[model samples]
Target chain A: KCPLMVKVLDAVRGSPAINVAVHVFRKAADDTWEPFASGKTSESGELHGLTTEEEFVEGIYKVEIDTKSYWKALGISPFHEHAEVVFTANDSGPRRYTIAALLSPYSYSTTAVVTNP
Target chain B: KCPLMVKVLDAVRGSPAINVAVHVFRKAADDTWEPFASGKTSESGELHGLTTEEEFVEGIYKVEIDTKSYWKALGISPFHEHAEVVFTANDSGPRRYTIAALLSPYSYSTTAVVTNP
Candidate 1:
């Protein structure tokens, strides 16, 4: 099974984005976006079982963070309410892709990497 | 404390939006948006202690549902990723406001009503 690993980090503090909300999506046959999975980050800023390798289908996928809801609770103004990472799922082999996000109230960055198995 | 009530309902089924994620926001003095509070819905599709009346300050407040995250987990393609209900917090007296959402994969509706004490 191919796995999609999602991790969130605080961009400013260079720390994990603890308790942050994370979501996953996939592209539909009609070129529409559909939801796939959802979870919240742990103290380590990670969510397990976001999706497995076997669950992947060749198409586009996305991971979105609820930054607006998160920072607002801390009374911080976020430049954007949501931060998303969209990537093409080219899982022709057995491998896991790590989708990581560096986030802040004002900005965010995300990257995806194939883990060596 | 005045309570900001948040509830989610399925637009198609007319049932509670079970296990949904809900978030709150407040507008900043500089007209910027900020995060306020966040929680997941129960089996009843409700979130308690979202915020109290006393916790509110006069300003523009919003309640947002991570419709994309929630519906995505269910493998649903929501027409929109986020559904927000923006209201003016004019809590000059003791009163609670019910901010409820009716949601679907294609459309959504939200309303706020004062809960008579």
Candidate 2:
């Protein structure tokens, strides 16, 4: 079984992004985003175990970051208020994967990785 | 001075994404994207040194993945080709950063991290 992991960071200052709200969505047949899960970045800027291993499946998944709320709290005007990373999960085999984000008021980025057990 | 680093992976298969095309761009003041650099994923799925330390500057940056070409090579119909990760590079301090990507035929994701040298 595979579990989804997420990490957030401050790209400019080069630190873990703290208190950022992150959400997960699954794509529907009509290409609509369906909410799957929700969480926030911890002190270490990480959100582990988005879903249970038993719930893993094959399909399209998207991770959205609430930069607007984060930036508002930081008292900074963001060039872009929100950011997202979308990827397909072909979990035919059991493997753990990680999705990480690096962000700033003006920009944001994300990546997914399979962690070797 | 900070150098931009990139790594690519296969989210489904949980392996390095070899021989994939990755491009970098800088956002113009008029909200246009200007080509910055280009490279391909190596056997390790990593591209180091996108720009020289001296060339790094403060601005918005974007990394684009040519999934259309990659999926064609793999003979898979990708739901979305041409995935991009947009971020701001505030490299006022001397540090290095990494941009990582995980891609599948249907979707893709990216993230950036600052590496301590």
Candidate 3:
């Protein structure tokens, strides 16, 4: 099955960014973001079943990760309101994708990796 | 002084990814990337003097991290040959940019953070 996965890590904590919220959005033709699915990172910093390949067909997408709430929950201040990863999928062909993010109180890094069949 | 920095971590090892090479390149009018600067991450997972504000003017730049060698040095096989962070900087104002990457054997993510004082 085609899949989309998210992996997050805490730079300060040096571990998986657990319990973090991940929201998926499909970009509309008019430049607005429409929500598609949402999930919270598990203890392994991975969230599964975000969407089905049947629905994730061809589109421009964004993954917004909630960094503020994560830091706040740990009693710290974060710099970003949230973090996002944007990319075009299924444009060239069918593939598996993993969106990974590394977060800190004051910064974050997001990247996308594609696995081809 | 204005600075550009890079921090890297090992998602699998749960620590700073040390001594990974960092290569900086500037996009030219020819749509080609020309060499700009280079360094390797220290024990703190940081590289200094990668660039200076005087030279890091408004332009599209790229930072390529040698993930393959990093994993090989650690006796593991990494899927990515290298990881890159690309962005247009100082477009509207002065800013400090830090490139961050989290790497694994089979996956990696690269993101940038802008800090302006």
Candidate 4:
């Protein structure tokens, strides 16, 4: 099973955020954000198979959603520079993660679901 | 118009997070978190009329959810200490905010919807 997944929903439109870009970053030891993986949401508003279990080591990670661009492409002015969720990825379990974001033009929410694989 | 509201959903149950306690706080001059208002989500997982425009000045505010107790009462183990959303309530517009959150056992997301009143 994929270790990392992303789900995006447009609350205003009551639909999935298709084609929205999601970027993953890992905090490097030097305290800078280093790119890890990226993808776009599918029809179900979910992006899967992002990182292999071996590559996703224990560390702090950031999930950045290209929300503003998504809204702009639809010709709507939005608030917030972007949406970000920063959290710790613990290796203590057979953990798989699903990051879910509920989006609106001026507001967005990001959630994480960690499951045992 | 009522300026602030809250919406919550349980990703695990695919339903509203009914009765989830929402605590609101405003940042004080000394940088302390001063309590502003509080309420519990209804059957629809929404709490409206938490603050009026007069009481809600443009400043930093935090919306906190008592996630652990919600899950514990339901006989599940959750991860986060709690779920929190912090942002600035801009007054440039007749802004009415709907803070939304999607929740799971190990992960949660908080989103905002700013609309014209």
Best by DockQ: 4
Pairwise TM-score winner, candidates 1 and 4:
4
TM-score of only chain B in every candidate structure: 0.85, 0.84, 0.91, 0.92
Question: Relative to the true structure, how large is the alpha-carbon lDDT of every model?
Answer: 0.69, 0.72, 0.76, 0.77
Model 1 chain A: weakest 10-residue lDDT segment is A104-113
As for lDDT, the candidate ahead, 1 or 2, is: 2
Superior by TM-score: candidate 1 or candidate 2: 2
Backbone clash tally (model 2): 4
lDDT of candidate 2 over B1-117, digit per residue (tens): 338787878876688887888898888899788888998888898887688866667787887777767777778755443676666565455357666677765545555555456
Worst 10 residues of 4 chain A by lDDT: A85-94
Give DockQ for candidates 1 onward, in order: 0.02, 0.09, 0.09, 0.21
Global CA lDDT of candidate 4, please?
0.77
DockQ-derived CAPRI band for the predicted complex in model 1: incorrect
Docking class of 3: incorrect
lDDT of 3 by residue, B6-112 (tens): 78888887999887888999889997889999988889887888777678888777777887688888798544556665556786565787666677676565555
- Per-residue CA lDDT of model 1 for B21-75, tens digit only, reads 7878899999766888888988888888877666677777777777767677878
Write the residue-wise lDDT of candidate 4 on A1-117 in tens digits.
478777889988999988788899998999888889998878888878888977888877877778767888999977655666766676365677787888887767666666676
For model 2, residues A75-115, the per-residue Cα lDDT tens digits are 77555436776666654466666876777765455555665
TM-score of chain B of 3: 0.91
**How displaced is residue A60 in candidate 4, in Å?**
14
Pitting candidate 2 against candidate 3, the one with the higher lDDT is: 3
